[PDB]
Chain A
Amino acid sequence: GQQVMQIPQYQHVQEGEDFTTYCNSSTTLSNIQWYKQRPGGHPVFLIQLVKSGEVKKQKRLTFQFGEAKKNSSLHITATQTTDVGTYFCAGYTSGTYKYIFGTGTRLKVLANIQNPDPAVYQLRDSKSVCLFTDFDSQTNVSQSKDSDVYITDKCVLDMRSMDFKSNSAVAWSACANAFNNSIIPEDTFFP
């Protein structure tokens, strides 16, 4: 009878770029609510809209409710890394006791790298691992189909005190060959 759908499934956006998620209901809604779920957390309420055509601004977030009350959007201007997570909508229809949640849009914010310095370094156990770091966010790191070639996907770390961000990925089982399945910068430093 009722379906609440959200598109898109996910979205990888460059820091400072815009993000939009769209919520559709097959039945007319009384009101619509938006939630954020930080990574590894649970949905926490952002805002509620009630009136057809209503627009609310909450910091960098703009929320919109359609004229027929069957559609809503959440828009983020100038996404920041801190905006990462899944955004969920939820419809309420008068007469029921239920909040019906959309399927969610996952937001992944790629950091803007001021000074790419792609390098692969070897680290030794305290009691063998390779770190690919300082590459541009346009790089995709791939997994090899080896019995014991484990490569982690890239994540962005933020040295807050130094106002510095960096991508990195980790591979373990030689560093020279570890990331051979990936297309890495030609100038990657292998000390």
Chain B
Amino acid sequence: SHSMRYFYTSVSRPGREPRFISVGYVDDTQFVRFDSDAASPREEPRAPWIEQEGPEYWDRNTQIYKAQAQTDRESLRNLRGYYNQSEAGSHTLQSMYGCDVGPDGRLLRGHDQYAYDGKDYIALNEDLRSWTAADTAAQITQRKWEAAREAEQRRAYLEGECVEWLRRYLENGKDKLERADPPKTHVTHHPISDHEATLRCWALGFYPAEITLTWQRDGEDQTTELVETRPAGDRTFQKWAAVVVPSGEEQRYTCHVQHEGLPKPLTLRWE
């Protein structure tokens, strides 16, 4: 069960042409990047297994990003019109598209969605035959797209090419992509007073990002301060859960950790 996604962002900067940014992911691994603000804008690798691609790959992708950027400039002009916004405002057009594959490597689902100024705009439905428009401006886009039979056009990449590239990347990156890193776990103790302490359960250097951390007191779930999962910076992730406890009762508390990389769930205690 794997996935590929491209995320595009165009941002208008009246007085300063729009900026275009692309990132690509396979699962939780960013692999490619493009930034129109760069010294000499080009697609660049961001994961080891993509570095083997020849110059033709980089050149082609670079030219795609440049052409997309120009279309987005035009799309931004249309959107400004649809919403009767003035020529002073900075605005944001976002695109996310790609494919999901099941364990058999076959297409599970395609994705193709857009947002204007942080809010849903238009999205291709799961059937890959119809659109959902978020408002009446989006319906202008919707009608034009229906007239052009846009969803049928999108099927070629979403159902074909997308899955082929995902499969190439899975094979080139087998080591890192098909294998999970289990969390390095441990529990820390932090006195608040002579009467109260924090127990914190750490999960460090795991991949992928999906993880479960729960605290139990005498086996009873304590639903805990839970932080949002954060990047370690080396393509692994980190997260922690903490519970405040009366001093001397630490021994009653256990942290339960669940992760794809663990043969079995882990239970830890402050000792």
Q: Are A and B direct contacts in the complex by CB distance below 8 Å? A: yes
* Interface of A toward B, CB cutoff 8 Å: 30-31, 48, 50-51, 92, 94-95
Q: Which of B130-138, B153-161, B176-184, B216-224 binds A?
A: B153-161
A30: which of B56, B57, B60, B164 is its contact (CB, 8 Å)? Answer: B164
Closest to B57 in A: A95
Q: Are B161 and A30 in contact (CB under 8 A)?
A: yes
Instruction: Please indicate the chain B residues that have their CB under 8 angstroms from the CB of A92 in the complex.
Output: 156
Question: A50 and B159: CB pair below 8 A?
Answer: yes
The answer to whether A94 touches B159 (Cβ under 8 A) is no
User: In the complex, what distance in Å separates the CA atom of A95 from the CA atom of B161?
Assistant: 9
User: Per-residue CB proximity of B225-259 to A under 8 Å, as 1/0?
Assistant: 00000000000000000000000000000000000
In the complex, what's the smallest C-beta–C-beta distance from B129 to chain A, in angstroms?
A: 13
Neighbouring B residues of A48 by C-beta, 8 Å: 152, 156
B165 at the interface (CB under 8 A from A): yes
Chief secondary structure at chain A's binding surface: loop
Residues on A with C-beta less than 8 A from B155 are: 50
Q: Which residues of chain A come closer than 8 Å to B56, judged between CB atoms? A: 95
Q: Specify which chain B residues have a CB less than 8 angstroms from the CB of A51 in the assembled complex.
A: 159-160
Contacts of B159 in A (CB 8 A): 50-51
> Taking beta carbons and an 8 Å cutoff, which residues of B are in contact with A?
56-57, 60, 152, 155-156, 159-161, 164-165
Q: Are A50 and B160 in contact, with the CB atoms below 8 A? A: yes
| Residues of chain A with a CB closer than 8 A to B57's CB | 95
For the complex of A and B, list the 3 residue pairs with the smallest distance between their C-beta atoms, beginning with the closest: A50-B160, A94-B161, A30-B160
A48 CA to B152 CA, complexed, in Å: 9
A31 vs B56: C-alpha distance when bound (angstroms):
21
A50 engages B156 (CB within 8 Å):
yes
Closest residue of A by beta carbon distance from B164:
A94
* A94 / chain B contacts, CB cutoff of 8 Å: 160-161, 164-165
**B156, B164, B165: which has the most chain A beta carbons within 10 Å?**
B156
A48 CB, min distance to chain B CBs, angstroms: 6
CB distance from A189 to the nearest CB of B (A): 54
B7: min CB distance to chain A, Å = 21
What distance in Å separates the Cβ of B124 from its nearest Cβ neighbour in chain A?
15
Subset of 20 A-B contacts with CB under 8 Å: A30-B156, A30-B160, A30-B161, A30-B164, A31-B156, A31-B160, A48-B156, A50-B155, A50-B156, A50-B159, A50-B160, A51-B159, A51-B160, A92-B156, A94-B160, A94-B161, A94-B164, A95-B56, A95-B57, A95-B60
The residues of A that contact B165 with a CB separation of less than 8 Å are: 94
In the bound assembly, the distance between CA atoms of A48 and B161 in angstroms comes to 14
Chain B residues positioned under 8 Å from A95 (CB to CB): 56-57, 60
Tell me how far the C-beta of A91 lies from the nearest C-beta in chain B, rounded to whole angstroms: 12
How many angstroms between the C-alpha atoms of A48 and B151 in the bound complex? Answer: 13
Q: How far is the CA of A91 from the CA of B164 in the complex (A)?
A: 16
Q: Which residue of A lies closest to B159 (CB)?
A: A50
State A157–B195 Cα separation when bound (angstroms): 104
CB distance from A93 to the nearest CB of B (A): 10
State in angstroms the CA–CA spacing of A51 and B56 once bound together. Answer: 26
Residues of A within 8 A of B156 (CB): 30-31, 48, 50, 92
Task: Kindly state the separation between the CA atoms of A176 and B180 in the bound complex, as whole angstroms.
Answer: 90
Instruction: Name which residue of chain A comes closest to B152, CB basis.
Output: A48
Distance in Å from the Cβ of B110 to the closest Cβ of chain A?
11
Please measure, in the bound complex, the distance between the C-alpha atom of A51 and the C-alpha atom of B107, giving whole angstroms: 10
Contacts of A50 in B (CB 8 A): 155-156, 159-160
Q: Give the distance to chain B from A50, nearest Cβ to Cβ, in Å.
A: 5
Given A48-B152, A50-B159, A94-B161; 10 other pairs, CB 8 A cutoff: A30-B156, A30-B161, A31-B160, A51-B159, A92-B156, A94-B160, A94-B164, A94-B165, A95-B56, A95-B57
Q: What residues on B are CB-neighbors of A30 within 8 Å?
A: 156, 160-161, 164
Cα distance, A94 to B160, chains bound together (Å): 9
How near does chain B come to A121, taking the closest CB pair, in angstroms?
A: 51
Q: Which of A51, A92, A94 has the most C-beta atoms of chain B within 10 angstroms of its own C-beta?
A: A94
User: What CA separation (Å) do A100 and B56 show in the bound complex?
Assistant: 20
Measured between alpha carbons, how far is A31 from B156 in the docked complex, in Å?
A: 7
Q: Which residue of chain A has the shortest Cβ distance to B168 in the bound complex?
A: A94
Inter-chain CA distance A31–B161, complex, in Å, is 9
Q: Which chain B residue shows the least CB distance to A50?
A: B160
Neighbouring A residues of B60 by C-beta, 8 Å: 95
